[PDB]
Amino acid sequence: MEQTLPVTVYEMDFLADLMDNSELIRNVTLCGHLHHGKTCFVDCLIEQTHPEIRKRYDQDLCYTDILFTEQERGVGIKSTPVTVVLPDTKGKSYLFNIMDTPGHVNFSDEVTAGLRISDGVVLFIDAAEGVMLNTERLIKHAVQERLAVTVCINKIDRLILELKLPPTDAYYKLRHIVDEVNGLISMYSTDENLILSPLLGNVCFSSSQYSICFTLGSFAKIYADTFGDINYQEFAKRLWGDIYFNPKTRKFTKKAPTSSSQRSFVEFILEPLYKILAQVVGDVDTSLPRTLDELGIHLTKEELKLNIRPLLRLVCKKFFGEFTGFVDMCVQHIPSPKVGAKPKIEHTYTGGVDSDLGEAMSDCDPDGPLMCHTTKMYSTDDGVQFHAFGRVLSGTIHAGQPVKVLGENYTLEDEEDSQICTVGRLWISVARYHIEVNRVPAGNWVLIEGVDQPIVKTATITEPRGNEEAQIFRPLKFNTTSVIKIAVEPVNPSELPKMLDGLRKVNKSYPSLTTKVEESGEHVILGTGELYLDCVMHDLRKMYSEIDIKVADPVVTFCETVVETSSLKCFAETPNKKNKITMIAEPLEKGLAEDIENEVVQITWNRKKLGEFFQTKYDWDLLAARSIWAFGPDATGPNILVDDTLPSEVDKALLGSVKDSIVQGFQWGTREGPLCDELIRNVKFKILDAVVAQEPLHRGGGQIIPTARRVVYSAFLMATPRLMEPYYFVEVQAPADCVSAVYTVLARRRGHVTQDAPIPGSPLYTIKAFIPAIDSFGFETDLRTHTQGQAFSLSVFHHWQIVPGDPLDKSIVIRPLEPQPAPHLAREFMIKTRRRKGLSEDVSISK
Amino acid sequence: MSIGVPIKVLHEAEGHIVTCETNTGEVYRGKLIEAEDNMNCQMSNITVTYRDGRVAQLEQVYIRGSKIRFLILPDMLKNAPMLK
Amino acid sequence: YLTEHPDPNNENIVGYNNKKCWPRDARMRLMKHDVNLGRAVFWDIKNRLPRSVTTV
Amino acid sequence: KSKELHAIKERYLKFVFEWDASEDTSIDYNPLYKERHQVQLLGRGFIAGIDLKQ
Numbered sequence A: 001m002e003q004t005l006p007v008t009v010y011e012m013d014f015l016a017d018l019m020d021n022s023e024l025i026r027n028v029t030l031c032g033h034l035h036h037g038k039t040c041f042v043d044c045l046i047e048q049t050h051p052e053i054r055k056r057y058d059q060d061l062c063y064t065d066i067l068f069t070e071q072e073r074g075v076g077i078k079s080t081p082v083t084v085v086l087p088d089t090k091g092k093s094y095l096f097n098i099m100d101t102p103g104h105v106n107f108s109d110e111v112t113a114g115l116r117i118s119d120g121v122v123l124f125i126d127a128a129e130g131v132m133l134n135t136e137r138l139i140k141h142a143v144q145e146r147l148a149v150t151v152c153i154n155k156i157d158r159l160i161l162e163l164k165l166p167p168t169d170a171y172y173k174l175r176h177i178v179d180e181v182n183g184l185i186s187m188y189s190t191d192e193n194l195i196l197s198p199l200l201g202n203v204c205f206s207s208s209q210y211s212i213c214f215t216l217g218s219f220a221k222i223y224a225d226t227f228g229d230i231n232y233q234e235f236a237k238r239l240w241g242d243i244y245f246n247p248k249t250r251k252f253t254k255k256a257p258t259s260s261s262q263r264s265f266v267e268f269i270l271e272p273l274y275k276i277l278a279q280v281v282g283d284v285d286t287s288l289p290r291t292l293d294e295l296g297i298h299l300t301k302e303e304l305k306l307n308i309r310p311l312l313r314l315v316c317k318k319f320f321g322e323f324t325g326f327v328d329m330c331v332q333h334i335p336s337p338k339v340g341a342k343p344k345i346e347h348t349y350t351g352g353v354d355s356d357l358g359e360a361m362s363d364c365d366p367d368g369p370l371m372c373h374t375t376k377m378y379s380t381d382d383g384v385q386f387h388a389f390g391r392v393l394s395g396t397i398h399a400g401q402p403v404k405v406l407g408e409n410y411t412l413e414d415e416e417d418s419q420i421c422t423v424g425r426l427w428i429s430v431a432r433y434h435i436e437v438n439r440v441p442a443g444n445w446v447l448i449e450g451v452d453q454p455i456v457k458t459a460t461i462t463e464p465r466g467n468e469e470a471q472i473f474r475p476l477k478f479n480t481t482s483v484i485k486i487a488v489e490p491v492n493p494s495e496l497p498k499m500l501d502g503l504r505k506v507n508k509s510y511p512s513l514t515t516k517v518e519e520s521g522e523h524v525i526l527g528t529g530e531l532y533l534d535c536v537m538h539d540l541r542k543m544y545s546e547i548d549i550k551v552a553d554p555v556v557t558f559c560e561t562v563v564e565t566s567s568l569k570c571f572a573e574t575p576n577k578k579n580k581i582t583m584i585a586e587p588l589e590k591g592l593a594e595d596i597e598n599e600v601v602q603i604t605w606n607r608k609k610l611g612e613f614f615q616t617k618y619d620w621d622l623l624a625a626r627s628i629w630a631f632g633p634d635a636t637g638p639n640i641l642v643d644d645t646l647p648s649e650v651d652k653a654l655l656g657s658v659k660d661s662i663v664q665g666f667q668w669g670t671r672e673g674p675l676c677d678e679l680i681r682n683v684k685f686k687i688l689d690a691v692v693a694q695e696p697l698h699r700g701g702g703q704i705i706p707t708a709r710r711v712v713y714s715a716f717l718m719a720t721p722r723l724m725e726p727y728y729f730v731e732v733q734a735p736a737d738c739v740s741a742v743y744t745v746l747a748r749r750r751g752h753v754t755q756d757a758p759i760p761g762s763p764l765y766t767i768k769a770f771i772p773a774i775d776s777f778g779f780e781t782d783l784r785t786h787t788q789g790q791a792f793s794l795s796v797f798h799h800w801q802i803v804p805g806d807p808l809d810k811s812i813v814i815r816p817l818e819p820q821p822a823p824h825l826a827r828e829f830m831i832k833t834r835r836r837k838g839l840s841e842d843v844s845i846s847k
Numbered sequence B: 001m002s003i004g005v006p007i008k009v010l011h012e013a014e015g016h017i018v019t020c021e022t023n024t025g026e027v028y029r030g031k032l033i034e035a036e037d038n039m040n041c042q043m044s045n046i047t048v049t050y051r052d053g054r055v056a057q058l059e060q061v062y063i064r065g066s067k068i069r070f071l072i073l074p075d076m077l078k079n080a081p082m083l084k
Numbered sequence C: 001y002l003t004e005h006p007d008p009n010n011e012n013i014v015g016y017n018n019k020k021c022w023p024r025d026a027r028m029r030l031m032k033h034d035v036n037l038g039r040a041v042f043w044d045i046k047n048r049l050p051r052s053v054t055t056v
Numbered sequence D: 001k002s003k004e005l006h007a008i009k010e011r012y013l014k015f016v017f018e019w020d021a022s023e024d025t026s027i028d029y030n031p032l033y034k035e036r037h038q039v040q041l042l043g044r045g046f047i048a049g050i051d052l053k054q
């Protein structure tokens, strides 16, 4: 209000009054594979809700790729929120909060940030490409985060204009895409109530370039508006599947009348669209005005003079109109904030739904306690001040209202992370222009000013002097792991504080960015890939810090493991020479580390469930199965600590006094690692004898923890240590002829091809392969250059694999600037990483 | 040309609070769930006042459209795009 | 030397004269310890000479 | 291999009517940047100028 804004089809007063009714709000995130049409849709909708903001005839106005690099690269880099009022098929209006998410596999963190504050997902799938890598990854992520899933099969015009498939085969292609999505959903979810089918209204067909968007119901409504006497809802139930129309009986049967009879979808939906497009693009001068007369569209004379693409856009816009099918989909199959509040609190709130504050939050009552969760941070173009962005799950936030901001480490006993701040202004975020408001009720998305100071990634904003028992929302769980690592250093050491400030700012911007300072005074940035780090450095050098920053060569993060059991049972004693621990280290069973990290097992379980799980899944006896102490460096680390101390040999009651310290020592030791200060993975540590001093003045504190860490290191070093590379999963789409070239490019970088397969209904092929992360820099460029741009690849982290060599072997001599043979890659990876970290040149294997 | 504006406005009222006065002088105030082209209103959480003035609570109500005298709609619908 | 002239931000690597005629691998390699040692020995030598008589 | 290592080391350590051939580029060592896979255009598109039958 009182802000100069573009004129809309609606009026902002209606938008403001809709925000109070939480049953007319839909918090939706648009996600899909890269370049699958997710952005026109937003303008393809902004235009329909903004008469003056139109797309250029020869250039598409992205309107949500508002960034510089977004506009030149043409690649979605950051999520852009859009709040619009969209009419329904029945004429009703709902307030839509849409999250436009990037489709590149490197920027999945933005997608998770959008998924946190959303109640439903609209998955965009190219009709020609089909289900690609990121489509599967986002389906898994969405059904895991307990979000309603709907599908929009975009770019259906490619079936007509590019591939020129017969309408029946276009129907087969669409049905195959829907079936693939259904199979993926059933794979990643147990309950059946997420069946996707256009009969249920779950799936929409669209072509954003030409302003086409219809469900079965919307097309049946077009028929009904033309011929009044039909009931479009019952008509829509017969427009998909193997149901054929019988024109003699005027009834729809499950059996085709005679022969050469087409399915209902082809006869009534696909064939008219084929004919419209064919008329417009082939007979614009000859027989277009007549067909336009038949459909009831009247185009003015200067309008018929347009080029073929704008003319097709205009004709389809006249025929179809607004995107009512999309709104029908998202109203029927995406819960309102009021209804979807309960799963959101169940999943993303640390206090659980059962908590008293959890109940008031699950009601989504806007007169309750304030509970706002922010997941994105948007920087003004000056790059000085940020604006937090998130949804108000309860209560109502006001401009000028003092608030209590809780960080990610805030617990009910450690209340030092919270900080009081004052809200400056509130903007209802639209893609480009912010509409300033005075208050935002529950269930809405708000851009907050004044709370950006004490938060890094995520926050929970509550009210001071109330909500004493207010916990936080769980930090985002990302799809990938940041592996690619680069080091930064200012050109002039005098301006180091400037680079540090810029590093803090980029850490605020990118949700999954991890900036750390190593022991050697080296500043390190972790990213997902080359494009990710490229854009991070572009922001760092140009947006936040105006200084010159040197960049080191890209490198990956390694992990350390073992391959047999320790030869001699290690032991280590405290400086008091009274407390002594004996441990051995052995490799974990295959597939157990992944179970641990993926929370298939939790130490929060009672010893009974832990024991039965281990017994039935990995052949563990009850004694060892219930003997688990800790679960790696974190609560879900890929390492296990087990006590084999016999009750007779050691008194278990006294062992319990040092259990809580041996656990911490083991966690810290696995966090650091002895080889090259890297994480330890897939290692099982068994305690064999723990001699404990009776006097508590000798044990506990800073005496037993270092002994535990040292014994962990020594036990690890007996069993043959190995290094671990991160392995990337590459999916390549390329024509048939360039498949061999893809093989040739992969073979040079230690690549191993898993499978190549045709894309059904498309002339291309998909090659899926595994490549080491370190042997992947420039792989995309090599593939796109050797194939003259006809092959494109997206790489994503998959798993950890052992480096061929042996890290602890001094016999190998390495020259400074030559690639090494595989037989001793591990030795180089180990010593060079040690030199980079600033440690000694070699380890000291001992007891 | 076919369906009048007031019916559209009534369609917009779904989900809000509405008070309903039938020919029997009975006042039904509650959350309007659904409406049709005719005034058939499916509406919920009813605070119902009879002609004498007795007030009752009735969670689900479906009123025949022919038997509505007038319907009082929330004031924010005055800003509906359809009312412009 | 560092007690007399503290170097918190590692700025000692900026004013170091090198023999640019030699190849890069044959020049002096400006590691922090070596640079600090060279600066320290130069400062020690400079301190012995009073500035009024002659300067280095 | 040898040119590979040399490139690594290098990176990290009169009216002339006709152009001099010393100004040529694309004298590369990587076989992927010399024997570039030729676009076939589904076997139906062709490069401009050159004879079709060829």
Ligand SMILES: Nc1nc2c(ncn2[C@@H]2O[C@H](COP(=O)(O)OP(=O)(O)OP(=O)(O)O)[C@@H](O)[C@H]2O)c(=O)[nH]1
Pocket: A033, A034, A035, A036, A037, A038, A039, A040, A060, A062, A074, A075, A076, A077, A101, A102, A103, A104, A154, A155, A156, A157, A158, A206, A207, A208, A209, A210
């Ligand atoms: N043939 C065809 N092309 C389309 C259609 N819609 C969009 N495109 C084009 O396909 C490309 C997709 O660009 P965007 O729509 O911005 O991509 P996106 O889906 O937002 O994905 P990101 O790049 O990850 O942000 C652009 O060249 C569009 O102009 C469509 O319906 N048909």
